[PDB]
Design an enzyme around this catalytic site. Structure first.
Site, mmCIF file in Angstrom:
data_model
loop_
_atom_site.group_PDB
_atom_site.id
_atom_site.type_symbol
_atom_site.label_atom_id
_atom_site.label_comp_id
_atom_site.label_asym_id
_atom_site.label_seq_id
_atom_site.Cartn_x
_atom_site.Cartn_y
_atom_site.Cartn_z
ATOM 1 N N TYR E 26 25.916 47.658 47.133
ATOM 2 C CA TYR E 26 25.417 46.788 45.870
ATOM 3 C C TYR E 26 25.921 45.001 46.582
ATOM 4 O O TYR E 26 26.734 45.248 47.699
ATOM 5 C CB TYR E 26 26.855 46.555 44.775
ATOM 6 C CG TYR E 26 28.009 46.161 45.659
ATOM 7 C CD1 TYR E 26 29.017 47.538 45.916
ATOM 8 C CD2 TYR E 26 29.290 45.289 44.954
ATOM 9 C CE1 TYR E 26 30.036 47.538 46.040
ATOM 10 C CE2 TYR E 26 30.057 45.366 45.496
ATOM 11 C CZ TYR E 26 30.949 46.334 46.297
ATOM 12 O OH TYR E 26 32.334 46.263 46.920
ATOM 13 N N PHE E 36 30.800 36.688 46.717
ATOM 14 C CA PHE E 36 32.584 37.613 47.655
ATOM 15 C C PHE E 36 31.963 39.105 47.803
ATOM 16 O O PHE E 36 33.497 39.003 47.999
ATOM 17 C CB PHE E 36 33.034 37.114 45.769
ATOM 18 C CG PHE E 36 32.492 37.859 44.400
ATOM 19 C CD1 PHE E 36 32.925 39.463 44.448
ATOM 20 C CD2 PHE E 36 31.321 37.390 44.079
ATOM 21 C CE1 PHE E 36 31.813 40.322 43.326
ATOM 22 C CE2 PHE E 36 30.638 38.611 42.990
ATOM 23 C CZ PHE E 36 31.211 39.915 42.893
ATOM 24 N N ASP E 37 31.498 39.823 47.386
ATOM 25 C CA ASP E 37 31.647 40.803 48.196
ATOM 26 C C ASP E 37 30.563 41.145 48.327
ATOM 27 O O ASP E 37 29.487 40.954 47.920
ATOM 28 C CB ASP E 37 31.983 41.944 46.655
ATOM 29 C CG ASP E 37 32.963 43.342 47.071
ATOM 30 O OD1 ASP E 37 33.232 43.295 48.635
ATOM 31 O OD2 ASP E 37 32.834 43.948 46.212
ATOM 32 N N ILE E 56 34.068 48.233 37.460
ATOM 33 C CA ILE E 56 34.221 47.718 35.558
ATOM 34 C C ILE E 56 32.943 48.017 34.882
ATOM 35 O O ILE E 56 32.332 48.969 35.545
ATOM 36 C CB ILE E 56 33.811 45.796 36.579
ATOM 37 C CG1 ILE E 56 32.443 45.524 37.014
ATOM 38 C CG2 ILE E 56 34.677 45.013 37.138
ATOM 39 C CD1 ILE E 56 32.548 44.313 36.876
ATOM 40 N N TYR E 82 36.921 41.096 34.489
ATOM 41 C CA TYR E 82 37.682 40.051 34.843
ATOM 42 C C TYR E 82 37.884 39.014 34.246
ATOM 43 O O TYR E 82 37.000 38.326 33.622
ATOM 44 C CB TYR E 82 37.552 39.527 36.248
ATOM 45 C CG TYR E 82 37.666 40.651 37.280
ATOM 46 C CD1 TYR E 82 38.379 41.809 37.403
ATOM 47 C CD2 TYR E 82 36.717 40.587 38.065
ATOM 48 C CE1 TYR E 82 38.466 42.882 38.339
ATOM 49 C CE2 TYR E 82 36.393 41.696 39.003
ATOM 50 C CZ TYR E 82 37.555 42.765 39.067
ATOM 51 O OH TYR E 82 37.083 43.366 40.090
ATOM 52 N N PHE E 99 25.519 41.637 40.510
ATOM 53 C CA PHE E 99 25.330 43.010 41.298
ATOM 54 C C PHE E 99 23.556 42.236 41.734
ATOM 55 O O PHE E 99 22.792 42.468 40.457
ATOM 56 C CB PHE E 99 25.504 43.066 40.714
ATOM 57 C CG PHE E 99 27.530 43.269 40.682
ATOM 58 C CD1 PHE E 99 28.232 43.550 42.051
ATOM 59 C CD2 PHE E 99 27.953 43.062 39.511
ATOM 60 C CE1 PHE E 99 29.446 43.153 41.731
ATOM 61 C CE2 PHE E 99 29.461 42.240 39.394
ATOM 62 C CZ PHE E 99 30.120 42.819 40.366
#
Lengths: 385, 444, 283, 255, 107
Positions: E26, E36-37, E56, E82, E99
């Site tokens: 991902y 961010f990831d 999530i 979140y 994503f």
């Protein structure tokens, strides 16, 4: 002057105060590093004794009182309206010199830094003012570097104000230094301060400069140059094809770049315009180029999803057909013989146009330009050459 | 011929660097000369490492690894400021170390690891933080003191190691004495456990420490208790709740393993008589009513709800009369334990006779006889089968009479037949009669 | 574990090898200075650099003297290099004196006297291992009454007008201990009980005999050879603002030691035979 | 970012930003380290470490950030655990001897069988899609083998190139070239990742003639500046400590 | 509240069935486009098995509505991931997450 006595009756020893402030700065000036070590120690002992005597006689509170009395005036123009014009010009210099004297008095003395803990809260209340921001920041740094107690007085609101100083006054490394001193002092880490600084500064991604790895992207174009003008002997419709022999999706951690379409020169120069020579920019990353990636239409570094039969990012064994019409500004595509449901209109036709493909590493493509150079897998649209 | 050895290579390299250039950074000079000294004093490595070398069996390897991880967590948490989460982490790690088995099985490894030093460093940080702000994070002091008390109880060598750090503990002995439920959790308790049941340590005890304790006790008699008067307890001129703790420490200092350390007892008696304010208002000598009247007054306070309670969690209600009574019982117990042994009196040492005469002058026989004559209040059953229970945490306790009996046996002595008969009649038969009446199964 | 501890104490501690003089001689060599591109003043030798570092640390202003293992080891090494210690002839004794004067020269030519004065001054009258090592180094460099070292020390003291040196000396004299009959009686009681700690019991009486002896030997060597100037300086420091009477302090310490010895004698007055521990304390 | 060689204000601000990134995660703030893993990633850190044209300030800052986020927490624990020797009595412990073979020739420091108890190495995978908070314990994971190989290769290149005394050291100065690299090497050695032939090769790099296995100049004879001399002293201190630990283990084996 | 548009087609039959571990790479990016990831940066595939609230819920059903070997871009409304607090230090409050997910293997 605050009680509004008439200006000439009140006497302000402006020059005397300025000269005395400069002399006191010289008095509390730290020793030079080129001096020999014994002289170092002697000057350091003298400076420490001077600071101790000044603190015991309460010379710090008097400076604070003068500073507070001077900040009642919003601006130098206002102070020049209330007092005399010479005081108006000297007001900024006196205010900076007072903060410098406070910093020199508290620097290097742990006892003075500890006694300034109570007044810290009053000091940070005027950090936003541009008239005293540098001096207040220097005083705060000098207190925080040497006062372990001070970090126990610094709170979440003070941290937020210090952070917002970056947002309002722009990038300044001294605020970052103050924030670093807040985190760790004398080898001891304040985890609450660390958590607050992180959670209040990092997630925004709007103040600190950001970093990332970007794949290099290069551009291939033929020699042909296509333009439209009044009284010009060039056909207005054109069509070419691109064939994808092989494409690796993820050669690196980032996605492979592969875009095809048309690009436009600026004016009549043979150089592509509006784009950087080298970097991660390709077809469609500016307003001079128009691109297709198999899912989106790229123009001006903005991508919009366009529907097509069996949508897929460009894979192995894909035939891309590009159509350019200059009679009415219009660029259309067609994948594997199925027409895509999007096109460009009303783009600038002043400059010359040429086919172009942008890519990162890991592609294997061929230009099917037609005729001797290529053979079109799909027969060209009517009226397209 | 090359160096062929790391030692020779270092010895050549450091000297060559130093003679080649004048090093400006003092840290580089320090590091180079430390390394050169280590090369030229290779036996130093062994003489330093071997004290910190321990051997364990293979069966305890996992358990030792767990203890070492907990100790590493506690050690690493010395570089962070005291807080709520750090408090929780200290507490869980110390509890894991207590629950761990190698902590009991191998005290020598525990001492070689310097664990008590780390725990007391945490305590020093907590106590120093906010000296004028009294005490913050009061559960660190409690947990660390409990850990150190257990560490003292594990072995004698650990007890001596903790005794080495005595002056600081007595300096901060007044951390949590007034607050209840903290018994065994104050630095004074750590000191008491460090000097507990060890003749060598009791004899090594110094005079200045006893002077410090005596001055604290004198202050506890001169001045009231600020926290109690703030919470609303009635104001009296002295502080029994802390006086009792300071008296228990002196008891442990003077009395050990059944006998009494005369060297540590004579000094305590001399300091107590030098400062007569330590004896409480009844025994100050400035119109003091006496011990017998004082304990009757304390009983009356016990029945009185207004003076017993603050009258603006159950342990927070300090029963004032019981506190005064416990203070007097502890003082009498300490004096009786400080009384000299009877074989020395047979030998005829003048100092022991002088001490016994001083004690007899301090406490008359009649007062002790009266306090022994005082009786309790028996619990009784109602209609309903529910025996009503007078609050044992309050009221007059047999432990109070126990100290009276100890003093009477150790100082005055029962050597006269009619005196024994009179004592029996006045105070001993009623107690046995009450015990026999309380022999029913429900009341048992 | 017991074997590791016993082997440590019995063998590793007792193992002795001598390297101090060789180390100091190698550290004092100016190494290939003309081959090196000095191009200026003679570069200080490694020993000179070590002495300069130790002297700057002492001169640094600070409330207390921290124990420094580097100083602790190197002061001992330098003192052993100095002393390096049946009837001898005139030439043999004069060779011994001449070799000692050179072994002492290697250190007092690089600023050892100033270091041993500075460390004592910074001690501020607190007895400690650092002070003990400094006193031993001073004795080692002052053995025989070295006039050059005495002159350097006196000139340094007069030039920088240090009252802290004499104040620290007086504080150390006051801190020096004497016989303690109470401690002796407590040790006897413990021995009678039967659990004996000979390492602990013995040191309590006459806490630091070696420290006291070194402190007074340093003071004697400071005036050795009838150095009138330094003898008068110890009595009255004329230049300094404050004056401390080292002579009267020494007399007071003698008076205290006399009272301690008399009390110990009175404790053994009735007893016909003196025990071995009492004999050791008397010695 | 290589363009920042000429923009001084941006270079200064970014160097201080990197220092702040280190400060917020300093002294075992594992949650903050996990948060910073999002902003500064593994591929960016590796690229910054490997790149040759990076400015010296940014190079030093990125080296320090890589050390602080991933490799500082365990190195500190092992350093605090270093001066203590708890050795179990097993067959491996009993097999230990002072000298490797019959002749009394010193073995290479570090290489050998050590049975003394040492702290466990545990790392957490940094992922922001998982909801569980158990990952906040333990520092974020890193490819230690890749880092080891790159460190060895970079040291091998730097020793060979610096001896020629070129006018273009990486970072602009010899200090910028060597201090961060030796610091990462020292941190890895303290962690104990290096084993067997890797240790042999890096000891050959440190000094060819002495650590020769049974001209070329090592790091010790290349006339290095004082900051790098301090790091060399630290490395040599660690080697001596390893020798002392081996001696202690052999003594316990004989006992 | 999760829209999925395919980036690359999959087999279209081997959907994720329940109680099964999913191997995915991902790449998470904010709405403005800041990454961010990314699991590819860590160079190890991500493993999570379905129905146990490890990840999530947007990433849950967005991966559940997929097929083996299919690459697709998953848009998560703030309330699924979140919602209001956000993830301290990484994701700001009230953020929409994008994503890029590839389903390599199911076991």
């Amino acid at each position: 002057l605050s009680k509004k006595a008439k200006a000439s009756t009140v006497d302000l020893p402006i020059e005397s105060v300025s000269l005395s402030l400069q002399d006191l700065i010289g008095y509390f000036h730290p020793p030079d590093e080129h001096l020999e070590h014994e002289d170092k120690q002697n000057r350091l002992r003298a400076l420490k004794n001077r600071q101790n005597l000044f603190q015991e006689e309460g010379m710090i509170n008097l400076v604070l009182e003068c500073i507070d009395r001077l900040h009642v005036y919003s601006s130098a123009a206002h102070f020049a309206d209330v007092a005399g014009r010479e005081a108006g010009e000297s007001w900024k210099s006196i205010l900076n010199s007072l903060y410098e004297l406070l910093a020199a008095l508290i620097r290097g003395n742990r006892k003075n830094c500890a006694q300034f803990s109570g007044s810290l809260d009053w000091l940070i209340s005027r950090l936003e003012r541009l008239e005293a921001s540098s001096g207040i920041l220097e005083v705060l740094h000098c207190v925080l570097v040497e006062s372990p107690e001070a970090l126990n007085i610094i709170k979440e609101g003070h941290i937020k104000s210090i952070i917002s100083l970056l947002d309002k006054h722009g990038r300044n490394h001294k605020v970052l230094d103050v924030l670093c001193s807040l985190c760790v002092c004398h080898g001891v880490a304040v985890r609450s301060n660390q958590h607050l600084i992180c959670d209040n500064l990092l997630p925004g991604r709007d103040l600190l400069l950001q970093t990332r790895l970007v794949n290099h992207v290069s551009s291939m174009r033929p020699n042909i140059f296509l333009g439209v003008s009044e009284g010009s002997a060039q056909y207005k419709k054109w069509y070419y094809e691109l064939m994808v022999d092989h494409t690796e999706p993820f050669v690196t951690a980032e996605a492979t770049h592969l875009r095809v379409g048309w690009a436009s020169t600026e004016g009549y120069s043979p150089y592509p315009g509006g784009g950087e020579e080298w970097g991660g920019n390709g077809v469609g990353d500016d307003l001079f180029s128009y691109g297709f990636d198999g899912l989106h239409l790229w123009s001006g570094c903005i991508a919009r999803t366009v529907s097509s039969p069996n949508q897929h990012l460009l894979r192995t064994d894909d035939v891309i057909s590009c159509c350019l019409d200059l009679s009415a500004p219009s660029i259309s595509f067609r994948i594997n013989g199925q027409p895509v449901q999007g096109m460009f209109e009303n783009f600038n036709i002043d400059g010359l146009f040429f086919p172009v493909v942008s890519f990162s590493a890991g592609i294997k493509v061929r230009f099917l330009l037609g005729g001797r150079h290529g053979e079109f897998k799909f027969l060209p649209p009517p009226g397209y050459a | 011929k090359k160096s062929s050895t790391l030692q020779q290579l270092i010895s050549e390299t450091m000297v060559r660097w130093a003679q080649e250039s004048v090093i400006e950074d003092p840290e580089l000079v320090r590091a180079m000369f430390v390394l050169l000294h280590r090369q030229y004093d290779g036996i130093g490595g062994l003489v330093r490492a071997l004290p910190k070398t321990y051997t364990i069996n293979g069966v305890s390897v996992e358990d030792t690894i767990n203890l070492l991880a907990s100790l590493g967590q506690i050690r690493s948490l010395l570089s962070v400021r005291m807080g709520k989460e750090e408090e929780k982490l200290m507490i869980r790690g110390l509890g894991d170390i207590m629950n761990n088995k190698v902590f009991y099985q191998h005290p020598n490894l525990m001492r070689a690891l310097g664990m008590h030093e780390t725990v007391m460093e945490v305590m020093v940080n907590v106590l120093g933080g906010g000296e004028s702000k009294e005490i913050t994070f009061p559960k660190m002091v409690a947990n660390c003191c409990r850990f150190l008390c257990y560490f003292c109880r594990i072995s004698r060598q650990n007890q001596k190691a903790m005794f080495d750090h005595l002056s600081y503990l007595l300096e901060n002995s007044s951390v949590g004495l007034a607050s209840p439920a903290m018994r065994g959790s104050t630095p004074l308790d750590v000191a008491a456990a460090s000097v507990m049941d060890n003749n060598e340590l009791a004899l090594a005890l110094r005079e200045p420490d006893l002077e410090k304790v005596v001055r604290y006790l004198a202050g506890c008699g001169l001045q009231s208790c600020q926290m109690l008067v703030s919470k609303g307890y009635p104001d009296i001129g002295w502080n029994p709740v802390e006086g009792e703790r300071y008296l228990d420490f002196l008891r442990f200092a003077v009395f050990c393993n059944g006998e009494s350390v005369e060297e540590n007892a004579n000094v305590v008696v001399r300091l107590l008589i030098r400062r007569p304010e330590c004896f409480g208002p009844a025994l100050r000598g400035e119109g003091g009513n006496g011990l017998l009247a004082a304990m009757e007054e304390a009983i009356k306070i016990a029945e009185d709800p207004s003076r017993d309670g603050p009258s603006p969690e159950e342990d927070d209600t300090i029963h004032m009369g019981n506190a005064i009574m416990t203070f007097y019982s502890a003082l009498i117990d300490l004096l009786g334990r400080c009384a000299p042994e009877m074989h020395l009196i047979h030998a005829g040492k003048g100092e022991a006779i002088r001490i016994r005469s001083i004690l007899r002058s301090l406490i008359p026989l009649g007062d002790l006889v009266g306090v022994i004559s005082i009786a309790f209040q028996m619990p009784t059953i109602a209609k309903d089968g529910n025996v009503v229970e007078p609050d044992m945490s309050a009221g007059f306790c047999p432990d109070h009479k126990a100290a009276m009996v100890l003093f009477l046996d150790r100082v005055y002595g029962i050597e006269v037949q009619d005196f024994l008969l009179h004592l029996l009649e006045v105070g001993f038969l009623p107690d046995l009669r009450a015990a026999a009446s309380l022999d029913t199964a429900a009341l048992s | 574990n017991l074997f590791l501890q016993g082997y440590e104490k019995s063998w590793i501690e007792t193992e002795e090898h001598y390297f101090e003089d060789k180390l100091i001689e190698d550290l004092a060599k100016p190494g290939a200075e003309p081959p090196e591109e000095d191009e200026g003043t003679k570069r200080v030798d490694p020993l000179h650099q070590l002495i300069l570092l130790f002297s700057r640390t002492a001169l640094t202003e600070k409330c207390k003297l921290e124990e420094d293992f580097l100083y602790m080891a190197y002061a001992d090494i330098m003192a052993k290099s100095c002393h390096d210690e049946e009837v001898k002839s005139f030439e043999e004794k004069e060779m011994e004196k001449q070799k000692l004067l050179y072994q002492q020269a290697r250190l007092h030519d690089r600023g050892a006297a100033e270091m041993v004065l500075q460390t004592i001054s910074a001690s501020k009258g607190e007895t400690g291992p650092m002070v003990a090592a400094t006193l031993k180094l001073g004795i080692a460099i002052l053995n025989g009454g070295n006039s050059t070292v005495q002159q350097k020390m006196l000139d340094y003291l007069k030039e920088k007008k240090d009252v802290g040196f004499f104040q620290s000396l007086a504080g150390l004299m006051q801190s020096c201990s004497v016989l303690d009959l109470n401690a002796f009686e407590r040790q006897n009681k413990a021995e009678g009980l039967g659990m004996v700690t000979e390492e602990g019991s013995g040191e309590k009486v006459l806490q630091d005999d070696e420290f006291t002896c070194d402190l007074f030997r340093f003071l004697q060597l400071l005036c050795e050879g009838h150095n009138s100037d330094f003898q008068n300086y110890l009595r009255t420091q004329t230049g300094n603002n404050t004056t401390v009477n080292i002579i009267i302090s020494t007399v007071d310490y003698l008076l205290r030691v006399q009272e301690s010895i008399s009390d110990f004698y009175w404790y053994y007055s009735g007893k016909d035979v003196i025990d071995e521990q009492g004999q050791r304390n008397f010695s | 970012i290589l363009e920042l060689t000429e923009q001084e204000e941006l270079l200064k601000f970014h160097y201080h930003t990197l220092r702040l990134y280190s400060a917020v995660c300093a002294l075992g703030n594992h949650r903050v380290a996990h948060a910073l893993c999002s902003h500064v990633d593994e591929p960016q850190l590796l690229y910054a470490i490997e790149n040759k044209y990076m400015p010296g300030l940014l190079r030093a800052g990125y080296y320090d950030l890589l050390i602080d986020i991933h490799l500082s927490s365990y190195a500190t624990a092992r350093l605090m655990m270093n001066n203590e020797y708890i050795v179990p009595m097993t067959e491996e412990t009993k097999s230990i001897t002072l000298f490797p073979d019959e002749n009394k020739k010193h073995g290479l420091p570090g290489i050998g069988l050590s049975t003394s108890l040492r702290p466990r190495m545990q790392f957490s995978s940094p992922s922001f899609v998982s909801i569980s908070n158990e990952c906040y314990q333990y520092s974020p994971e890193f490819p230690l083998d890749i880092l080891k190989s790159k460190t060895i290769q970079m040291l091998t290149e730097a020793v060979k190139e610096g001896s020629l005394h070129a006018r273009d050291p990486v970072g602009g100065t010899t200090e910028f070239l060597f201090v961060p690299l030796i610091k990462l090497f020292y941190t890895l050695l303290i962690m104990g990742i290096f084993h067997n032939e890797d240790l042999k090769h890096i000891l050959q790099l440190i000094e060819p003639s002495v650590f020769k296995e049974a001209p070329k100049e090592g790091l010790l004879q290349m006339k290095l500046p004082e900051p790098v001399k301090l790091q060399m002293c630290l490395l040599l201190q660690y080697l001596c400590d390893c020798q002392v630990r081996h001696r202690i283990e052999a003594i316990v084996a004989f006992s | 509240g999760v829209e999925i548009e395919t980036i690359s087609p999959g087999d279209g039959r081997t959907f994720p069935k329940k109680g099964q571990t999913c191997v995915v790479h991902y790449t998470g990016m904010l709405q403005n486009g800041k990454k961010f990831d990314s699991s590819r940066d860590r160079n190890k595939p991500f493993k999570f098995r379905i129905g146990k609230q490890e990840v999530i819920k947007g990433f849950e059903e967005g991966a559940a509505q997929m097929s083996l070997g299919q690459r697709a871009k998953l848009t998560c409304t703030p309330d699924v991931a979140y919602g209001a607090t956000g993830h301290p230090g990484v994701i700001p409050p009230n953020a929409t997450l994008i994503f890029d997910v590839e389903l390599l293997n199911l076991e």
